[PDB]
């Protein structure tokens, strides 16, 4: 593997300090759309003291950490692997996770019960 | 990335109880906890102190005396940082309000020269008693007084007889206040140590330059007197802040002139002659060359062995010989081979 | 543009490792006999000794490189710097960027163990 | 003929109607039969450099081919060179990356006939470190181009006379147009007092930057949509 | 004196250049109020920082500032001027010149309106009306 | 010009808190904190507008359904400090109860173009 | 009057600038940093200062409340936040409020109470 | 137009005390007709006369000798900018705002020490822990 | 498409200035084009022939400063230029003298533009005819629950 | 000729009054030359915040789009049906070259001719050889033009100059610039 680190013009520090996630992102419980789910975001781990701070003067979030708004997208889990020891950086990688497929009647919902009801259905 | 250099931790808390977390890096967008007062802070050496100060995020107050000086502070620090107010020394609702809500408080008034408004007696030790009484009056923690080298009271000169006089009654009043002695300061565009060698029309005095002091780089006072300021070991203590090696000044007039590679002027006239004529130019608006600083001509420097150096600190000055050359850059002026190469070119077109 | 500027060397990739060598080794020559020229260029205000200390770290900094490509990546952009600092392109505050230790100690505390850079959380 | 005698102009019967009249129409249609000219002038330019062409792509009266970058030369000569082509001038060329590929960057060169009244586009590929040849041997309009495309990306261009930065700092480190390269940068600048000059530092913000890039739809916003493609160029349906 | 004749050194270098040469124009004219621009800073009272200013500049800038006569002011010009302004989250850029020099009228705009910039302009001169340069030295 | 926050007739502070201004200002000047109130009606508890990093688009006027922030056409507000030119809540009220006459006649001539 | 600033000593502002507004002395919100917290976290800067000057401009939670109370005869009140001297569409986006429970209920809009009756 | 005669009538008709006031106060010899005062006071007038030129009709004349653009009040700052026709105080009771509360105007006080100072509107994100000990 | 309607009276007035503006710029005329001092100050000084000019990538006033007729909104016409009535001033000598006579012909062109599309301007809709591209007016979004959902769309 | 001089009392500037008008028609270069000035009761009467026309003023809109009833969304939307790019490998010119088109197809027995297909698919023939072991008639048909020449680059709208020369020109002669229409 060719080590890219040193002709991007990336800092040392970057490389050796920081640790970095490729992941899928969740679909989200609230909505019940899936098109932000298929890209595999690239994304930093936080710095303990660098990350955001309150500001005397206002109240903003001032930052010392720069790369937190950084955030890449790949089509694969390979070239996001390839790409990220590419320019020497120690990553984790997180497995998705599918629901899992039950086949579903609706004729389900009403059929005989010939002990306890033990459930009363409503629709 | 930045660092706080300045501090130990993160966590401070003050003698006066107060809790002080550092945010975030180091650097100019990120605040450190304390509020500092520096009085003088348009002085020579209170540039580089609040320059040093304001770098990491103290928020410093200045109480400035004319408004159109301190404009070259305000790039030092970030938005909100450095906060200018008005004082005149004369009102102390000035000097009450400036130390109000200040964690730390310097103070660099001193003056050299006598004016019609303010004698050595008025700015050395009663100016020093206002903003000591103040500081006594507001509980502040780590009041620190700077005052000249050689500063006595049996001394014959007034300005270090006044200096001796205001070190004992800010140690009468604040019992916690750190006093700090600095020998002559060279720098950038100094007062009257570098850039009077480096333009004086004649460069006249008594003594045939035979007085003894070393000179120490203002940084490097800034630097100690900041590295003063946040650790609680130096108070009550009084410390000598002087260079290296010890120097006279045809020593330092030739190191000059061999950097300059000019001649500087010396002339060396009797001293009541020299007195009568600073007494004479004492009568214009302009700062001229004191007739008590005659008498300083002659005291040397005279270091106290029961005081502090750089070595408790933990820091090295660094000598004036290596840093003649970048402080006199400004002066300075500026065969056969050449002309056996320049025969190839073309002059004429 | 149809002439270049003066010191200038039309881009061009190697495939032996030896050709290589022999260019970055003029490349050490073309930095060193220019170093009394950028002393006097940038008034700085040390000795021309520690900039050519300075060119020889740099050097010392990408000795054991393997791959020829990033070798050659490499000398390409040590030209462009070379042409840049002679020309006097760069300022006296840009080439001041190549010295950030020497001009001034940053201040008291440095933190080696892990007691003193526990205290201030690695600052 | 006088000018206080001079007629109003803001009490006169202007113009109206009661209802406008506009039809819909799709402006791709008016593209259609010049797209089917497109398509079968880049067959052509396809057999006839079979050795340089890997494809071509036509989106809508915009025709692209699709070149090995060790290729670039001899097909810019002939969009040059042949009489039916004469893509003399220039216009603008550059690169994009897509991270996700092996080879990172793809440089597009974009030409005018002003002849012909036409453009063309060239892509070819280039990795980070592998370069992609010059064309300014060809077009004295070219380097600088080529250069801004060097200092933004790091896509080489060997055979280049004065290739370096340009539009960026001086002692820069970095290509700031790289998904990598953060958008605030490393670096920032003062004006330390003590050494009485200006200083890079690490990067520091007093507001922190929000990207409102989290928070896009999660509902996939357009469909696939039809084709211009002429019945003449996709494969027949056997029977 | 210092008011009746206010000589500017012309910096402006972008968008807000243009609207300084609306100040020159002949509807919202500068020369009747005593204004011209000797564009050589050994001569400008002021500098007006009139537009960004990147990392590749601050030096200049500086550079040109330093240049001036002692009595010296300078006023910012733009949004771009003070705090960055639209590429305020830019790689090279300064976040506005109170970083480089000191500033004294910020003129907030972001093509900061002719009206706008001499009403920063008549701010400045009422600055220079109670500079007291010559009651400070009798020590008020 | 510079900016402000209206009031409905009989004093009400017209900002929903909607977050619109914010998400399409295209300097990130705006900065907000929401909080549901005593009332449980929902405002601002905090709105800020940096005017350092305003470019004066008009795009926090056209996205606000509520109409609470306008731009008001005063361009003589020139300061001498940084910390001036930060507008917290309190200035752009205050801005909004001053211009309020002015602004009558901006939106009497305007809101039926917008 | 006279509120600590974290070392013991005590500073001193006028009672009438220790308000909110001069509608309301309290906070009207559980984060709202009621103004004696605001002097005491930075006094460093309201010194040498008016605090006359400053703009304190009439808290809206108490212009609202001493508004009178519409009554509504129907089921759904329905509401603008429109004048109709101003030529345009002014005020908020309709909405229609059920007057059904005890009490008036609020347009949470415009905060005008409406109460069936 | 720049013509003496013009500057002459208008001095005529202006009369020599107010003359010299305006002369202190602009370059120009404007005669008016009094549309308005402010609230602040300022006395607003406009032009009939036929050699004027565009945007020379309406005009100011201030009250202090310090004068500033920020010192005319909201609703009269929009008509001497010819954005209305009718001033404030020819308008109708239909284009006054209905307020519940009272009017103030502060002009501009940059450098004087009623500058505006900027605060959290809010108090600090996350709060910390009051001590209480327990004897066990 | 286009922000918002333009105001009432504005198309009463580009007229007005236009009556004058072509007298305006006449006068400027005067003391440049037959100036000796300007022509000699401009005469063979930039020139760049028909084959270096394109080869430089250069466009617009510059390449039809040296003969070649091309420009965009004749060639490959766009927002309706093509029902706009006008001509174009392209120079023979590739000098700065003709990239200045040019431009001081590509004003009165534009002032030609100006007059026919004040007389030939037509009614109806300034944006585009539908709320999920830009957003609907403010009399709309206020009354429709689907127009409020565009809105709050568009912006977010 | 239609656009010449005019004279100076159609064109909306303040002029000049009575002997002064007779002093400058001889002390001048053209006398139907304007001052510049606009007239102040016609140029911006009345100012824009104060219109008649703003109180009147309705959301335009065409006839086919406001339509309440007739017109379904999916029906004149166009954002949606756009095209896409028409992306050709150099194998699937093989198949256009081999197969045929659906224009013209080549094509006999269908359920072979999918077989026919899928070495192509898979890289049976090569392009060179697919030029090579074409016909003639199908080289000069679809490659090329149908006279055998190349095909010229394509342009969407020919433009067809018309220099205009004489008095109609926007420079006299002996000027070095030309009206090119
Ligand atoms: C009218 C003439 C000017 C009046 C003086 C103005 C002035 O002094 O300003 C100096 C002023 C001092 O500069 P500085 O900032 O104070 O720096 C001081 C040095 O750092 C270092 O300072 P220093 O330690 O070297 O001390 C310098 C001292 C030098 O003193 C000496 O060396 C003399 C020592 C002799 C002592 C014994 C004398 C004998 C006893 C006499 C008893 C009485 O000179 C003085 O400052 C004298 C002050 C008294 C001035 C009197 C003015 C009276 C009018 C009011 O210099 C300038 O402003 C330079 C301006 C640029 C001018 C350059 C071009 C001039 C060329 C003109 C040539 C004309 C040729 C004609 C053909
Ligand atoms: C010699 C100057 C000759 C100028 C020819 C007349 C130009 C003119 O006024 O036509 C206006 C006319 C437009 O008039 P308008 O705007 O429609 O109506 C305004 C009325 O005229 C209403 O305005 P106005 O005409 O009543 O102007 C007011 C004028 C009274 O009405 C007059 O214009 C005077 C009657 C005209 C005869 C010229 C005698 C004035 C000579 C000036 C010296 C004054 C002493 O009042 C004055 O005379 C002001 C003088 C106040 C004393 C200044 C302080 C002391 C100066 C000491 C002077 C010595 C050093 C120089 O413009 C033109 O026709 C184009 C002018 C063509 C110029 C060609 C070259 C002229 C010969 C070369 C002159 C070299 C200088
Ligand atoms: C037209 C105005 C010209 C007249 C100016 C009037 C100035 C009024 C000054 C009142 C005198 C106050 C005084 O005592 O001044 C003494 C002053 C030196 O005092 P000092 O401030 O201490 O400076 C010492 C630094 N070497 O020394 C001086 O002030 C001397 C100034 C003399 C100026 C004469 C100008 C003729
Ligand atoms: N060789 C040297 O430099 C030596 C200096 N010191 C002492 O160090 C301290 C500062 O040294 P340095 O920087 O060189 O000189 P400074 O220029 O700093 O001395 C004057 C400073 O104090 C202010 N000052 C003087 N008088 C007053 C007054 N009545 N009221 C208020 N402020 C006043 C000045 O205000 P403003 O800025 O407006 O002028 C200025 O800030 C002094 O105490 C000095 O005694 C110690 C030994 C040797
Ligand atoms: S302040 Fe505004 S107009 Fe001026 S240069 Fe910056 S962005 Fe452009
Ligand atoms: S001002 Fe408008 S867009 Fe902004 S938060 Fe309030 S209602 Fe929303
Ligand atoms: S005017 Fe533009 S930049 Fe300013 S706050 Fe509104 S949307 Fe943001
Ligand atoms: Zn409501």
């Known amino acids: 593997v060719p080590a890219h680190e040193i002709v991007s013009g990336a800092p040392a520090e970057l490389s050796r300090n920081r640790v970095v996630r490729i992941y899928q992102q969740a679909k989200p419980a609230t909505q019940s759309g899936e098109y932000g789910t298929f890209a595999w975001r690239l994304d930093w781990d936080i710095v303990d003291v660098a990350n955001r701070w309150e500001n005397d003067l206002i109240g903003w979030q001032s930052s010392g950490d720069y790369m937190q708004a950084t955030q890449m997208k790949f089509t694969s889990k390979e070239s996001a692997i390839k790409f990220a020891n590419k320019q020497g950086w120690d990553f984790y990688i997180q497995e998705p996770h599918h629901r899992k497929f039950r086949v579903k009647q609706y004729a389900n919902n009403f059929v005989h019960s010939y002990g306890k009801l033990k459930h009363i259905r409503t629709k | 990335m930045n660092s706080f250099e300045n501090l130990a931790q993160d966590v401070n808390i003050t003698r006066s109880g107060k809790t002080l977390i550092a945010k975030g890096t180091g650097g100019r967008s990120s605040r450190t906890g304390y509020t500092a007062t520096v009085f003088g802070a348009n002085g020579f050496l209170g540039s580089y102190l609040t320059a040093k100060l304001a770098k990491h995020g103290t928020t410093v107050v200045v109480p400035y005396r004319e408004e159109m000086a301190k404009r070259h502070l305000k790039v030092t620090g970030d938005l909100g940082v450095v906060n200018f107010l008005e004082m005149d020394l004369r009102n102390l609702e000035s000097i009450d309000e400036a130390v109000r809500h200040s964690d730390i408080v310097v103070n660099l008034i001193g003056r050299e020269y006598e004016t019609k408004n303010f004698n050595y007696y008025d700015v050395h030790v009663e100016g020093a008693r206002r903003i000591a009484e103040a500081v006594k009056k507001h509980n502040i923690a780590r009041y620190i007084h700077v005052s000249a080298f050689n500063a006595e009271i049996d001394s014959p000169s007034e300005f270090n007889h006044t200096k001796g006089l205001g070190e004992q009654v800010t140690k009468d009043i604040v019992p916690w206040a750190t006093i700090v002695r600095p020998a002559p300061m060279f720098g950038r565009e100094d007062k009257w140590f570098l850039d009077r060698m480096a333009r004086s029309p004649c460069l006249v005095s008594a003594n045939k330059f035979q007085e003894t002091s070393n000179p120490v780089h203002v940084i490097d006072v800034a630097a100690a007197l900041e590295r003063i300021c946040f650790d609680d070991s130096t108070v009550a203590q009084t410390f000598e802040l002087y260079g290296p090696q010890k120097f006279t000044q045809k020593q330092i007039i030739d190191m000059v002139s061999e950097t300059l590679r000019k001649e500087v002027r010396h002339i060396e006239l009797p001293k009541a002659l020299y007195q009568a004529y600073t007494k004479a130019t004492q009568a214009i608006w302009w700062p001229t060359y004191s007739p008590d600083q005659v008498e300083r001509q002659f005291l040397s420097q005279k270091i106290d062995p029961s005081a502090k150096t750089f070595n408790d600190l933990d820091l090295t000055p660094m000598e004036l010989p290596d840093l003649m050359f970048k402080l006199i850059r400004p002066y300075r002026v500026n065969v056969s081979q050449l002309e056996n190469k320049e025969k190839t070119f073309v002059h004429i077109l | 543009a149809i002439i270049a500027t003066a010191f200038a060397e039309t881009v061009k990739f190697s495939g032996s490792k030896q050709e290589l060598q022999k260019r970055t080794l003029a490349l050490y020559r073309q930095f060193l006999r220019g170093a009394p020229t950028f002393a006097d260029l940038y008034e700085v205000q040390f000795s021309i000794p520690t900039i050519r200390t300075k060119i020889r770290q740099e050097f010392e900094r990408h000795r054991f490189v393997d791959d020829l490509s990033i070798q050659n990546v490499l000398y390409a952009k040590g030209h462009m710097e070379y042409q840049e600092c002679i020309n006097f392109w760069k300022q006296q505050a840009q080439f001041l960027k190549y010295f950030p230790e020497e001009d001034d100690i940053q201040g008291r505390h440095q933190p080696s163990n892990f007691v003193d850079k526990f205290l201030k959380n690695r600052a | 003929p006088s000018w206080e005698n001079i007629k109003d102009i803001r009490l006169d019967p202007k113009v109206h109607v009661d209802e406008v009249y506009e039809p819909i129409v799709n402006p791709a249609d008016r593209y259609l039969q010049h797209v089917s000219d497109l398509h079968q002038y880049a067959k052509y330019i396809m057999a006839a450099l079979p050795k340089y062409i890997q494809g071509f792509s036509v989106w809508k009266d915009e025709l692209t081919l699709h070149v090995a970058p060790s290729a670039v030369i001899p097909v810019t000569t002939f969009l040059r060179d042949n009489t039916s082509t004469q893509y003399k001038s220039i216009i603008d060329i550059t690169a994009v990356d897509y991270p996700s590929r092996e080879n990172r960057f793809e440089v597009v060169y974009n030409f005018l006939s002003v002849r012909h009244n036409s453009r063309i586009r060239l892509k070819t590929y280039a990795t980070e470190v592998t370069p992609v040849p010059s064309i300014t041997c060809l077009y004295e309009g070219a380097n600088w181009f080529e250069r801004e495309a060097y200092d933004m990306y790091g896509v080489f261009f060997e055979g280049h006379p004065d290739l370096r930065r340009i539009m960026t700092d001086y002692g820069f480190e970095g290509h700031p147009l790289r998904k990598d390269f953060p958008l605030t940068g490393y670096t920032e600048v003062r004006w330390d007092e003590e050494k009485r000059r200006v200083v890079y530092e690490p990067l520091e913000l007093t507001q922190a930057f929000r990207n409102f890039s989290a928070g896009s739809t999660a509902w996939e916003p357009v469909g696939p949509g039809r084709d211009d493609r002429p019945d003449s160029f996709k494969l027949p349906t056997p029977k | ?140 | 010009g510079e900016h402000a926050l209206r009031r409905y007739p009989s004093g009400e502070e017209r900002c929903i808190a909607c977050k619109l201004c914010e998400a399409i200002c295209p300097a990130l000047a705006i900065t907000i904190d929401a909080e549901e109130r005593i009332d449980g009606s929902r405002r601002t508890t905090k709105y800020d507008i940096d005017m350092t990093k305003c470019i004066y688009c008009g795009y926090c006027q056209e996205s606000c359904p509520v109409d609470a922030i306008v731009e008001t056409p005063n361009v003589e507000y020139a300061t001498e400090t940084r910390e001036e030119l930060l507008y917290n809540k309190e200035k752009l009220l205050a801005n909004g109860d001053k211009w309020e006459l002015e602004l009558q006649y901006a939106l009497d001539a305007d809101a039926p173009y917008r | 009057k006279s509120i600590i600033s974290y070392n013991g000593n005590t500073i001193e502002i006028p009672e009438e600038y220790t308000k909110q507004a001069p509608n309301r002395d309290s906070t009207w919100a559980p984060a709202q940093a009621s103004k004696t917290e605001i002097y005491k976290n930075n006094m460093v800067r309201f010194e040498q200062k008016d605090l006359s000057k400053q703009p304190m401009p009439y808290a809206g939670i108490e212009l609202i409340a001493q508004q009178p109370v519409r009554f509504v005869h129907g089921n759904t009140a329905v509401c603008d936040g429109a004048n109709h001297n101003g030529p345009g569409a002014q005020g908020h986006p309709k909405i229609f409020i059920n007057v059904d429970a005890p009490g008036s209920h609020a347009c949470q809009y415009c905060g005008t109470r409406y109460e069936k009756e | 137009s720049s013509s003496l005669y013009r500057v002459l009538r208008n001095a005529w008709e202006v009369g020599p005390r107010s003359y010299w006031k305006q002369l202190n106060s602009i370059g120009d010899t404007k005669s008016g007709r009094l549309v308005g005062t402010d609230i602040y006071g300022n006395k607003f007038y406009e032009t009939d006369h036929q050699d004027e030129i565009h945007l020379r009709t309406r005009y100011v004349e201030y009250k202090e000798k310090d004068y500033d653009m920020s010192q005319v009040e909201p609703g009269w700052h929009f008509w001497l900018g010819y954005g209305v026709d009718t001033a404030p105080c020819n308008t109708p009771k239909e284009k006054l705002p209905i307020r519940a509360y009272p009017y103030k105007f502060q002009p501009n006080y940059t450098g004087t020490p009623g500058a505006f100072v900027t605060y959290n509107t809010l108090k600090p994100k996350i709060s910390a822990w009051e001590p209480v000990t327990k004897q066990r | 498409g286009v922000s918002q309607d333009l105001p009432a009276g504005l198309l009463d007035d580009i007229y007005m200035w236009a009556t004058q503006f072509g007298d305006r710029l006449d006068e400027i005329e005067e003391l440049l084009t037959d100036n000796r001092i300007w022509k000699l100050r401009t005469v063979n000084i930039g020139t760049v022939t028909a084959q270096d000019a394109l080869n430089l990538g250069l466009s617009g006033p510059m390449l039809r400063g040296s003969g070649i007729p091309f420009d965009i909104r004749k060639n490959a016409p766009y927002d309706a230029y093509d029902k706009v009535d006008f001509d174009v001033p392209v120079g023979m000598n590739g000098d700065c003298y003709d990239r200045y006579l040019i431009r001081m012909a590509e004003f009165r062109q534009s002032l030609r533009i100006i007059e026919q599309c004040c007389n030939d301007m037509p009614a109806g809709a300034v944006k585009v005819e539908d709320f999920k591209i830009n957003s609907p007016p403010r009399n709309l979004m206020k009354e429709d629950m689907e127009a409020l959902i565009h809105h709050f769309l568009l912006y977010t | 000729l239609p656009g010449g001089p005019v004279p100076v009392f159609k064109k909306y500037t303040v002029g000049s009054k009575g002997i002064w008008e007779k002093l400058r028609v001889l002390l001048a270069i053209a006398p139907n030359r304007s001052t510049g000035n606009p007239i102040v009761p016609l140029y911006r009467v009345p100012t824009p915040g104060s219109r008649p026309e703003a109180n009147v003023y309705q959301d335009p809109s065409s006839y086919p789009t406001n339509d309440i009833a007739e017109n379904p969304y999916w029906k004149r939307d166009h954002r949606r049906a756009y095209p896409q790019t028409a992306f050709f490998d150099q194998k699937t010119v093989t198949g256009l070259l081999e197969l045929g088109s659906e224009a013209t197809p080549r094509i006999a027995d269908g359920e072979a001719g999918t077989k026919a297909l899928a070495n192509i698919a898979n890289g049976g023939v090569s392009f060179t050889q697919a030029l090579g072991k074409s016909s003639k008639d199908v080289i000069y048909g679809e490659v090329l033009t149908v006279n055998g020449l190349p095909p010229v680059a394509p342009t969407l709208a020919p433009k067809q100059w018309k220099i205009i020369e004489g008095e109609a020109a926007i420079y006299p002669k002996g000027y070095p610039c030309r009206t090119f229409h």
Not at chain 5, 30 to 57: C, E, H, Y
Not at chain 5, 63 to 81: K, L
Not at chain 5, 92 to 113: E, K, L, M, Q, W
């Open chain 5, 1 to 140: 004196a210092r008011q009746g004749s206010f000589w500017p050194v012309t910096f402006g270098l972008a968008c807000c250049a243009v609207e300084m040469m609306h100040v020159s124009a002949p509807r919202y004219d500068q020369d009747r109020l005593g204004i011209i621009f000797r564009a050589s800073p050994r001569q400008s009272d002021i500098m007006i920082v009139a537009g960004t200013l990147t990392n590749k500049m601050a030096p200049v800038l500086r550079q040109v500032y330093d240049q001036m006569p002692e009595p010296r002011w300078v006023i910012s010009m733009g949004s771009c001027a003070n705090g960055g302004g639209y590429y305020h989250f830019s790689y090279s850029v300064v976040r506005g010149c109170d970083r480089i020099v000191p500033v004294d009228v910020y003129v907030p705009g972001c093509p900061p309106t002719s009206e706008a910039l001499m009403y920063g302009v008549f701010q400045l001169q009422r600055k220079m009306r109670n500079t007291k340069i010559t009651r400070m030295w009798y020590r008020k």
